[PDB]
Design an enzyme around this catalytic site. Sequence first.
Site, short mmCIF file in Angstrom:
data_model
loop_
_atom_site.label_atom_id
_atom_site.label_comp_id
_atom_site.label_asym_id
_atom_site.label_seq_id
_atom_site.Cartn_x
_atom_site.Cartn_y
_atom_site.Cartn_z
N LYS C 109 0.64 -1.12 0.03
CA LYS C 109 -0.09 0.13 0.02
C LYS C 109 0.73 1.38 0.06
CE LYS C 109 -4.10 -0.16 2.55
NZ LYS C 109 -4.88 0.54 4.40
N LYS C 121 2.55 -4.23 11.07
CA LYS C 121 1.07 -4.17 11.96
C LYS C 121 1.23 -5.04 13.37
CE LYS C 121 -3.29 -3.36 11.34
NZ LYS C 121 -4.46 -2.32 11.42
N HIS C 204 -1.40 19.25 10.94
CA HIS C 204 -2.75 18.66 10.92
C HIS C 204 -3.78 18.60 9.78
CE1 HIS C 204 -2.38 22.28 14.08
NE2 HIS C 204 -1.74 22.52 13.49
#
EC number: 1.4.1.3
Lengths: 496, 496, 496
Positions: C109, C121, C204
């Site tokens: 990915k 993971k 942000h």
Amino acid sequence: DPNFFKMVEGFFDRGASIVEDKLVEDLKTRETEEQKRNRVRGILRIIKPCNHVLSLSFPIRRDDGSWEVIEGYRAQHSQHRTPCKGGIRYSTDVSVDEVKALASLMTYKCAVVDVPFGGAKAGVKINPKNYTDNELEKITRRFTMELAKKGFIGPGVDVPAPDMSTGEREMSWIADTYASTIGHYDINAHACVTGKPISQGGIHGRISATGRGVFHGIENFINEASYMSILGMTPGFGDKTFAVQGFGNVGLHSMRYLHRFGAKCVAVGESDGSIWNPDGIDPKELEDFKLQHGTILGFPKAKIYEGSILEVDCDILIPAASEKQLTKSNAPRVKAKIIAEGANGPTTPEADKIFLERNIMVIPDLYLNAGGVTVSYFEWLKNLNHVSYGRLTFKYERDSNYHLLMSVQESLERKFGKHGGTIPIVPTAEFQDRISGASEKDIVHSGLAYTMERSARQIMRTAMKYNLGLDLRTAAYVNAIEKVFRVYNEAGVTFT
Amino acid sequence: DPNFFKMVEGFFDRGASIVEDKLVEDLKTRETEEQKRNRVRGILRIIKPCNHVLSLSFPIRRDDGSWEVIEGYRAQHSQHRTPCKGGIRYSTDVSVDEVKALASLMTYKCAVVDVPFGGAKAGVKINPKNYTDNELEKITRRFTMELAKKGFIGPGVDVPAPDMSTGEREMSWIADTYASTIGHYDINAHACVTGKPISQGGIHGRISATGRGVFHGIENFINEASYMSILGMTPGFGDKTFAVQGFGNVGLHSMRYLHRFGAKCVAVGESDGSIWNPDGIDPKELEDFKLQHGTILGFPKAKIYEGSILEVDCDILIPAASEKQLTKSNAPRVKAKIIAEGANGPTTPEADKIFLERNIMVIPDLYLNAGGVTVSYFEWLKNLNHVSYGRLTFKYERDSNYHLLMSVQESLERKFGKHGGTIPIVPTAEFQDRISGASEKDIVHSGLAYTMERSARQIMRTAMKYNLGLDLRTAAYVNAIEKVFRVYNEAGVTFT
Amino acid sequence: DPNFFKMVEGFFDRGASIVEDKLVEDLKTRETEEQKRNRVRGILRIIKPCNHVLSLSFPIRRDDGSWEVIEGYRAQHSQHRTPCKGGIRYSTDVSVDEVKALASLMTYKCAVVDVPFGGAKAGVKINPKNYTDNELEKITRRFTMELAKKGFIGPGVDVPAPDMSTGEREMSWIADTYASTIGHYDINAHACVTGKPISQGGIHGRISATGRGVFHGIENFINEASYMSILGMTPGFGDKTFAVQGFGNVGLHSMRYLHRFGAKCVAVGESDGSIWNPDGIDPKELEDFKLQHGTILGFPKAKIYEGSILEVDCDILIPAASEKQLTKSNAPRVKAKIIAEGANGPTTPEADKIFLERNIMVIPDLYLNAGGVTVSYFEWLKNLNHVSYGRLTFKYERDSNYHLLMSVQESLERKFGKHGGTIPIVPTAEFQDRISGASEKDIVHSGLAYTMERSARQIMRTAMKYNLGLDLRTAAYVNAIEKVFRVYNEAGVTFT
Ligand SMILES: Nc1ncnc2c1ncn2[C@@H]1O[C@H](COP(=O)(O)OP(=O)(O)O)[C@@H](O)[C@H]1O
Ligand SMILES: Nc1ncnc2c1ncn2[C@@H]1O[C@H](COP(=O)(O)OP(=O)(O)O)[C@@H](O)[C@H]1O
Ligand SMILES: Nc1ncnc2c1ncn2[C@@H]1O[C@H](COP(=O)(O)OP(=O)(O)O)[C@@H](O)[C@H]1O
């Protein structure tokens, strides 16, 4: 037939329960906020499972230019003691569930012999045959790499050792890889692994270690009239008589070191067949007779006898071979009064059971073949010391010893108008030879001996405060649990 | 009756001046660029103040969920010796000016007993009561953290120890915190602090350390007729008689170990009241009698006597309590002939003064309760050795010893047609029990005694050199000033 | 139709085979010792399995004083790119076999969106409910600890992220633990984990990230007439119409950002039931309407419609929920022409198959919800930069921009006797508000779309390279394999 993973797990739960009631107490007799202590049994649930286990796949490249990936595991049980110890297995039969059991085993095995390591164990799913010597090396080195990067090898983290599937060389490769790579800057880089060649920082007397461990373990109990009285021994029967099953390294030395203290190898059985002479089979020749050939079979003097010897008439039966060879079926059936586990878990939990009752003493694998581990600890220290044992003191005492004999001499020849009439100076024939050829090795044996004795007595006493008579095993596991406990206990709860 | 900070600082200036003239010489007899050496007194200006002192405020969180900030100081005096040593105090009366003084004290105290540490001392302005065991732990661990991050704890930087306000416990927490945090990768992580439990890497025979230090210190002078002549002693008066003020750990062992060698606890005085019997109060019971209660009071056989003991009729008065309890006023008043400082600075510089003149011998705190420090040095080494003292060697020598006795036997039995007639083999009754139950502690004890004696000798000459008579203190300071000077001299001259 | 671990594994093998013949060539067109390259497919055998996976058990202690051990795994697939990236899952359904699959998923990915991380993971076998906020924190921190010590977290080793089972705060705990412990000396200590609060070094625009990723991914293909021709679109049907299944964070923003550009939410379905209006359900309210409540149900305007939405008449169906919810059965059956995977593997390999045929475009999970990952990469960089994006440049170009508009003004007002007649200075209404309220966020948003835009045409060209037509998934999988391959090849095949 269960599998280890289990027996060990069962062996723990058991010792854990036996200790518990009396680990609220004999200890915090008292202190008792709350009186849940009964409770810092969370400690024992922490102790149980392995804290870390790393599985990894890594590529090597065969000599035929083909790429091949390789599976490998290493499990660290406890880290209550700061560097993890444990062997590396090169077998296609390695399961994650097993490296974990064996790691679990050594966590307690080390505790028994006061060796300050946490239990670990590695396994590489490989069969060392299908691979060349060049190919084997690449596997080791690349394996050493990945372990280091994830903190599963290091002189202060995790110190491996060889299994029967691996040799001193592979250990040498491991050390050399670590020292040339991640542990370049480590002044103790070569302390990252034990069981390595002498030229590479190995310790003298690593080879007899496991065998002598078996000897001193047997002997400590054989000279205790209590345990010898329940079997009705401090032996009376051809003085002594023993059978050894498994003529590997451990079984060989076991027979030798036991024979020489006035004990009688009635029978020796192996992978193939077996043999017998009720006069005494004699180490030595058998020994020669084989390196000589390839097997023990067709031995002069001694007899094709056959099947296993697990029940040849004797006192001491020594399993020095694979697993499980004392099941339940051949359990009410042995003869041997003393079963000395010279290998890891050669008796099922039920053999123990029938044995226990049949009033025969099973000296635990957890304690007995911990001889190799004890010496491996010494090798680790030797590397940390950066000097062979006894090197600065050997001559000092040789002088000191001669100085005493000189003192006894003079003092006696005053009593007494003389000079050199009275002659104490001369050491005994042996004391000379031992003074003469004193080496590191002598210290290593002497250390092993003291460790076995001190550990033998701590098992005897743990077995007694618990009213356990002949079940040395769970007494041994108990002695371990209590030790691993106070490390956890007297450390804290807040942080790690 | 000033701050303690002073006496030490006065004690130094003094020894410094005494040494100086004769630290231009006895050394560079000569060398003399310039003849300003007289000037490498800049060295002594450097030695004097503490080089570093870290003050910190850190938050813990009480069990009642409330936040609270905590003040704490640690001062490192000298770093001429590479790892700083010194205790941690949990008292609301800790001032920055004091941890500095006490750090200053140990910097010289270590030098006296040839312990290669620089002086340090920590104080946490807290009262361990108003806090739970859970709460106390949090304070330690968080305290250990901040010290580590600013380089005020570490096995090669600064090795703390407990004070009387703190236990082995808290040391265990400190070690475990460091080893699980900043010092995770340190193979000597648990060498970061001493005075910790045996299960956590502590050394055997620590409890008696400080107390025995007091004993051997007293004894070394008690067997020297010179000093025993000036007081007119090598004692005659009930053979021997001594009073102990302060029944803490140090005072307790002091009374026990002194009593044991034919000396007589006439009186024992504590925080509360006091106790007398001129026959001998007996360690032991008094000991038991208390564990027992909470105090020494209401002791059978022995009497409500009262106020302080400091002047009960005896020879040896042993201050094993707080500071300053020998001021000035009760100074020309003691009787005790020998004042054995079993605590840090329990006599004002003036008590010394009146004492010196009244012709009574004050055995310095700088030398006497350096017993704990000496053993703490051994614990540090033990961690570096990664093996308990005597382990690999206990059995080796037991064999060696029996081998000599065997040699003396044989040699005598040739002189002579025999076998087992002459029997040297047997050790003395004691030599057996010693060989029998040899443990790490025996090594530790032997080391402690060796150090105390040799330092006493070291002190006695530096006293007789400058003809200081019974001024044992400023002799021992002179001794220490000299030692700390040497390291500074033969090193840093142009930088660092 | 499969589960988890398997599809990914199948998805790889496939792309691997498709690439291979043309990975002896397009590449080493040539160079061919031997012509076995056909062979440096050993590379692809190395790429496939996860290189490392660490299982661990660690104790926490609950608020009720009871001890409890906790299981946890983290798997690092590839390390061809130097810091591993991947989320942490807090579910009792975590198997070692998934964390591996999902680690395997991200490894590719990241490659798709040119994010230079290796796939990882983690999973903690826990249910965050049965645990308090205080209890959850201890789990995270103690978990962070063990990962660090075995090299499974670190700003240059392994940078975790939250899953849906975990929040920004747990990430904050993770960062704070690492920075206060093992990574104290790391100037990039807070780069050890992403998805953390802004006050803790977060970036942000992280929340919209995954949702916008879905948007730009859809849009890139929606504006390509080729792919829009095969479906017969560049849409004509209510302009546009789309249904979203799963009103989580991703599905919500997806609907909002899609709606905004002239597209219609016909239907929204959830965990519970579903909702329809063919006019347009409107983000916003539905949005408000539920914060509001707890669910989408009982929505005015819009109807109890029901079961799953997966087949409501539309063009674009957006799975933003759990797995597998486009199987096989409901496969020849959707209508949506574009299936936009806003979640990981919501279509079985067979749904793909029927879809592919039914001539409908499935935009891969491997590419589409890589939006969060892309921005997480930016957060990692932000921490390395130690400064918010645009901070030193925002005002600089605000000035520069006004300077150009001033230049256009003057230049026009010469052409021409004037001053302030012609008025270019004014920015558009928006250009003002953009200039006005420019923040880091605007840079983050930008950087994401460029990534999604370029990755889109990377896949388009690869699908084109292998004639895959509408098999967008294994066009992307192939696209990733090539990338991971080249790294492996153009460096490490000797002892690395
Ligand atoms: N593997 C272990 N697990 C727990 N405790 C241990 C282990 N090995 C040694 N210990 C304990 O550490 C303590 C300190 O021992 P020490 O005096 O340093 O050496 P020794 O163990 O040879 O006596 C001993 O009480 C011993 O029981
Ligand atoms: N803490 C100390 N501070 C200053 N000098 C010291 C200290 N400890 C030892 N020295 C000096 O350093 C010299 C070297 O010591 P050495 O003889 O090698 O070891 P030891 O002090 O154990 O006998 C000693 O002669 C002693 O005078
Ligand atoms: N996870 C990954 N695995 C393999 N290759 C990658 C990965 N991420 C990026 N790359 C490759 O690394 C190369 C570096 O290109 P670069 O100059 O960094 O451009 P970009 O910023 O677009 O990555 C790119 O061609 C890209 O294909």
